[PDB]
Design a protein around this ligand. Sequence first.
Ligand SMILES: *[C@@H]1O[C@H](CO)[C@@H](O[C@@H]2O[C@H](CO)[C@@H](O)[C@H](O)[C@H]2NC(C)=O)[C@H](O)[C@H]1NC(C)=O
Ligand SMILES: *[C@@H]1O[C@H](CO)[C@@H](O[C@@H]2O[C@H](CO)[C@@H](O)[C@H](O)[C@H]2NC(C)=O)[C@H](O)[C@H]1NC(C)=O
Ligand SMILES: Cc1ccc(-c2c(CN)c(CC(C)C)nc(C)c2C(=O)O)cc1
Ligand SMILES: Cc1ccc(-c2c(CN)c(CC(C)C)nc(C)c2C(=O)O)cc1
Ligand SMILES: *[C@@H]1O[C@H](CO)[C@@H](O)[C@H](O)[C@H]1NC(C)=O
Ligand SMILES: *[C@@H]1O[C@H](CO)[C@@H](O)[C@H](O)[C@H]1NC(C)=O
Ligand SMILES: *[C@@H]1O[C@H](CO)[C@@H](O)[C@H](O)[C@H]1NC(C)=O
Ligand SMILES: *[C@@H]1O[C@H](CO)[C@@H](O)[C@H](O)[C@H]1NC(C)=O
Lengths: 727, 727
Amino acid sequence: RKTYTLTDYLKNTYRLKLYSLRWISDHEYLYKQENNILVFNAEYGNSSVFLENSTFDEFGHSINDYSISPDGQFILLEYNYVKQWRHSYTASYDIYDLNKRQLITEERIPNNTQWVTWSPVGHKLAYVWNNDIYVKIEPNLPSYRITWTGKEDIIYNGITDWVYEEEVFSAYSALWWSPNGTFLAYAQFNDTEVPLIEYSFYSDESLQYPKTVRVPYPKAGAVNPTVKFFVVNTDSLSSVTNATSIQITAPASMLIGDHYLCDVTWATQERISLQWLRRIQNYSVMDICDYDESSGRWNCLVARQHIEMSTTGWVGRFRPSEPHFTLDGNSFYKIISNEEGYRHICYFQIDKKDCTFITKGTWEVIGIEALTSDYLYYISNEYKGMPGGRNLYKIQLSDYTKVTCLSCELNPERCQYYSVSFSKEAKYYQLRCSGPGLPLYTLHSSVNDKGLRVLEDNSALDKMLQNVQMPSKKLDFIILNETKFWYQMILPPHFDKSKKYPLLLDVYAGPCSQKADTVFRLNWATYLASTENIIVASFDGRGSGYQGDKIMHAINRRLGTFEVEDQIEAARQFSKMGFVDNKRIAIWGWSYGGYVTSMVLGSGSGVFKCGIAVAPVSRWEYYDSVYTERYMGLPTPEDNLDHYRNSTVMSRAENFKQVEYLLIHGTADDNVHFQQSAQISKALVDVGVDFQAMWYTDEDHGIASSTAHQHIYTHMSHFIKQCFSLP
Amino acid sequence: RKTYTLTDYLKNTYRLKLYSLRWISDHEYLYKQENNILVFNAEYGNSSVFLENSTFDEFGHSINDYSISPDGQFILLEYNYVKQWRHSYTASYDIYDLNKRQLITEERIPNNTQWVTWSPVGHKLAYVWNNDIYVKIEPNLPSYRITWTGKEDIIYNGITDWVYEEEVFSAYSALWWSPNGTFLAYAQFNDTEVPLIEYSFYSDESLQYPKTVRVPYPKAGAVNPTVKFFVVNTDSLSSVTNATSIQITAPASMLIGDHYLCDVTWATQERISLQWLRRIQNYSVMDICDYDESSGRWNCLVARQHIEMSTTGWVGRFRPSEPHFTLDGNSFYKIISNEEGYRHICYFQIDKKDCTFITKGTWEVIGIEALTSDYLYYISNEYKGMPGGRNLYKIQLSDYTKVTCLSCELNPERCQYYSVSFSKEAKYYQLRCSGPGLPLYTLHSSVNDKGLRVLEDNSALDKMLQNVQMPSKKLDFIILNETKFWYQMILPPHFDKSKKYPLLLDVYAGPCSQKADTVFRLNWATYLASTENIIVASFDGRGSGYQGDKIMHAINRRLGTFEVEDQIEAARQFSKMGFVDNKRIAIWGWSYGGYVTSMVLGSGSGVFKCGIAVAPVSRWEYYDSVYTERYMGLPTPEDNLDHYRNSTVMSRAENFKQVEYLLIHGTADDNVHFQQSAQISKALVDVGVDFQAMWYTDEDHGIASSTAHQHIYTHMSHFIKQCFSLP
Ligand SMILES: *[C@@H]1O[C@H](CO)[C@@H](O[C@@H]2O[C@H](CO)[C@@H](O)[C@H](O)[C@H]2NC(C)=O)[C@H](O)[C@H]1NC(C)=O
Ligand SMILES: *[C@@H]1O[C@H](CO)[C@@H](O[C@@H]2O[C@H](CO)[C@@H](O)[C@H](O)[C@H]2NC(C)=O)[C@H](O)[C@H]1NC(C)=O
Ligand SMILES: Cc1ccc(-c2c(CN)c(CC(C)C)nc(C)c2C(=O)O)cc1
Ligand SMILES: Cc1ccc(-c2c(CN)c(CC(C)C)nc(C)c2C(=O)O)cc1
Ligand SMILES: *[C@@H]1O[C@H](CO)[C@@H](O)[C@H](O)[C@H]1NC(C)=O
Ligand SMILES: *[C@@H]1O[C@H](CO)[C@@H](O)[C@H](O)[C@H]1NC(C)=O
Ligand SMILES: *[C@@H]1O[C@H](CO)[C@@H](O)[C@H](O)[C@H]1NC(C)=O
Ligand SMILES: *[C@@H]1O[C@H](CO)[C@@H](O)[C@H](O)[C@H]1NC(C)=O
């Protein structure tokens, strides 16, 4: 009879089995068994082996990822993985012919390649190297040289810079092929005047002098990257003339000032859609641009432009959403907030100024997952009115009121969080279920939506978790000015409502965040509840997502206000329930959570004994322009400087005398710079408040190193245990 | 009923009075009584007015410092002080005609000036601005520019670079006037190929992007600054034809490569002495150079050369000793290591190389303080064979056996640590007594060694310390391996040795250090004994100074060995004394003391429960060449690399699992770089040992900001109380 220990969490004793497959046709997907990678047939299942691992063991180098070509002829191996930022990395690449049975040696892909992608059909390659774009019409051929202007830290061709990577595209890649892989669309970013963030990287103890890393990084109000857009034709590449890309200029109302490229989506072989966002991110335009054969140019007609804007806030959850065109390319679906401020699927005609909505209600559509000619498939939180649940729906295109829930009723107790993966023409789908019970992976046919087999139900984990004393998750709401607000609690085993438990408040609370859901987790909180008998709770107040614009846009231009006040009020609500020890309530968070934590601790509320802030923001002038300005506008006297000034944690320094505070930050944090914490510490020293700090040499925003990760949770555990007088 | 508290220490409740005087001649001096400046006399006794704050009230700026021309016709005012390194700073200056107290309005000295000085007689002015040397013959006349090669962070004319400032000269100036003010000697430094240490500077929270500070700084082994030495004739300075500076080169045996200028000392109006130290600091040379009148040149004869070398260690305490010259210039005295390790005064004939010792015995002369044609005055630790005492000895130059202690018998019980300040021809002298009693300042006639008067006796401070329960101070020795090793103890008031006290070991242990002496102090240790009833102890083990080369050279090429061992053995010996709590012994230290504390905590000896390291060295390769190499040699396969690698705190990480460790470091430490501590924390993370940490944003090696100084000492108090379970 024993608990889920810290060493359990940290060491990964109770492992969570996944089921990762890559569709490659309408009928088949690839998946790993004994490392020997196989292929399954969705119809019956004569799942014969595809690529035995007695192939690449004494190939010479460590395999990291691979990529099968669409036509199925060439596996693209990947080694020398060297991570950059959250998405970016560099690596070495070699190709392996299946039909010739061997690996290619001439016209090899350079070391230090920045990104690689196959065409969507066939086997063409496109790769970025040294900031320039290259294309290989055949793997064994010499590449064609698409761009000549790439320059380390200044001109990026076909890859994003820091801020486009982290904030706009969530990808290092910036190449998009057309469907039949004829045209290659790419973006080029210019960082010329984007000031640099500089910081030290101490490296191995063998490095005598520290290295100063320098990254183009626009802090709020700074000069932003500019952006241009190009399309080249890959079927007519010459070796005796430089291939000439065609520029598609942003629409007029974008060129009038600073703007971003926020979406690229091909609709047909000869039609592409670009979405642009103004720097003041409440106005955005979609351009449909058609290819003209008799000139070789692209034409975005004025009348095909669609405008999406917001008077209450910004546009989209984080950016405008992506269109989903019909086969013929004359219409699209995309999620937009309606008149009521709730996000729903709207159906657009290229020619018309106005769309008709095909979903509605006090819930939101999370995403469009597949569009056939008979049915639209989407994910929502409609079921049981739980904004923290996810389910698969299909809309009958011939009568959109006829909607079906595919996943709702499959396993009601076990499963209320779902995501889907469709076959190439959506004839089959894999259903992934992430809680409340053990995760569950299942396969299904689109014909009857009949369940075919269980892929992975984590019975392995179940069978050995039975004799661990597990905490229960409770998920509920409280009320506030006639509005529902949701929370979750990880409750210790044998929870007794007549005992006063100490309480940790797990906060993130950034705009569109959601901490109160039905996902099952084995994390630090599990340890605190299982081992230490600490109620760890999380709460979604104002600014939180997936419940409508009224709640989401409540912190518009006013960060460090309602989302902070609301965490404090949540605590008062939790004391008022009488199973909480008033004398032992704490708060912690990472990233935006670190900022809210810090603001709550400096609030003078008196509700919180102590807290921990990991890589927090300290004032918004220190964070990147694209995120920050979305919610804060510009930091100038003409826009929002006053509130930038009023929302710093530094200005609350004196009130840290009222709490025990632990501040942790990594030194190699490229994202929220160590600066932010340096300024916190300095302000606390200046008003004479005592507190604890911990820096993590060379660690980044996730402090993800194995040893660093273990060290930090061990440090926070000790701090909380001593904060709560735990033995 | 009350004790000396942490606030008493931080807010300076009980101040030590000083009698800081400066001699203007051989009869009179100055003193800051009130804050108005007064002239004083010792001749007939009287003392009149001279200056005040309202002489320079409507001035505007607050005066940081002043300086009278030797003749007393001019006063130089120092304001706009901006500190740089340990001695270097920049400032703005104004000159008054001290006769008329009116400012010299035109041809003013430039802002941002890096050093300024009067000639030894008359009123000549030499200053350095933008790394170039300037001379003002009459304060209202235009300057003459001496050098034209000054370039920031690259060529330094008349001022030191980082390492010459910290380690060689302990000064910013590299300018030296001749006794009558005709010649201005100076040094030029070239840091062209010297690598930069780089680190972030965060500044006020207004600074959106942190600043990167770049300092030329040779770590152990790196390329060093080169040097040149010049003299220029400040009388024949024209106005139409650039000044020509005569170069005195280093002797041959130095130019074989990599050497330093470590002493510059004039002998007459036309004779100057230079001392050069090979980069391997066990071989030094002295060159004596005569000005050739029918040439304008300086000639240094090979016969006149003398050589200071050491077969068992380096030469000097931290540098070759300075020479004091008899009036004719044909004779000089300088302290060197005698035949059997002890440091004593040697008498030199300029022409021949066989010197002869005027003192001997198992004690050391600390410094030669005054020279007349009659006697020679010096300070030493002979009295009662106490390494940690200082007294003033006078030796008869005609008969070396007839020596007299001028300070020994004055106040035996109160006063065992003297320093002296002579008048410009040694007819009068001040005695500073720094302990063991309350400091006492007394003026004497040297002509008959009669005590004239008590200047300051600290009877004010004596008065209030009777209302306070003050700690006692024990100074004694222990015999280890038939050798006397000295220690000091700060013992709680009402100390009773049938109790078991917790004991903090206060450590520095650096080469030639002394933490065991007769000096009275009011510091953190005073509070710990007085209030927290903690014994604070220090111990001078192998490597400490002022007890003979045997003891001091004991760790040559062997940092992190015997000085680490001996601190551990000190604790054992203290616990074996029977009034220490074995379960509660802590260790702490700053800078080199930080390094030792850490090595001791890493040693696995099990004696220490916990410890604090502040700005420690973590491995010797990171620290500056001049200091490190002297003790370690080069970190190369053919010299002493093995020991460099054997003596890092990183390698001892595993052993910190036995102790509570607090590691503190300022992020703007130009001296001991944050790196060193970043490598400590990373090592400890990587083996998985928990520890406390604290950075100080923008503090240097001193962590000397008012607020930070308060913050750190408060933080360290909490750590020690808690480690000791003090309530
Ligand atoms: C990247 O953008 C910069 C502007 O920030 C461009 O640099 C300018 O180039 C024009 C050429 O007409 C010059 O007149 C300017 O002097 C340049 N400005 C600066 C500040 O350098 C540059 O054209 C862009 N680079 C590319 C290849 O698109
Ligand atoms: C400082 O020293 C550097 C060498 O470390 C000197 O630089 C050289 O100067 C010569 C003569 O002008 C050049 O031809 C070399 O190419 C330079 N080498 C390097 C590495 O820069 C410099 O001249 C010195 N300055 C002074 C005033 O002494
Ligand atoms: C101050 C701060 C710092 C980081 C983030 C963040 C962002 C945005 N940079 C994004 C990209 C979004 C597109 C999801 N992801 C994550 C996981 C995080 C996060 O680690 O929380 C948000 C705020
Ligand atoms: C690792 C380290 C760091 C600094 C020092 C130091 C030195 C030498 N740089 C000197 C210059 C000497 C002439 C005394 N002074 C002092 C006060 C200190 C010190 O702060 O203790 C010695 C070792
Ligand atoms: C890449 O690196 C490997 C090993 O360093 C080398 O053999 C290969 O030729 C390189 N390829 C290219 C094209 O740079
Ligand atoms: C393509 O353009 C680059 C840069 O303008 C030029 O140097 C090169 O000659 C061109 N390539 C060929 C082979 O035509
Ligand atoms: C020093 O600088 C200030 C401010 O720029 C200026 O007004 C003053 O005249 C300067 N003084 C000298 C000595 O040049
Ligand atoms: C002195 O020499 C410098 C630098 O070599 C030169 O620029 C200048 O012309 C000379 N100055 C005068 C005042 O003659």
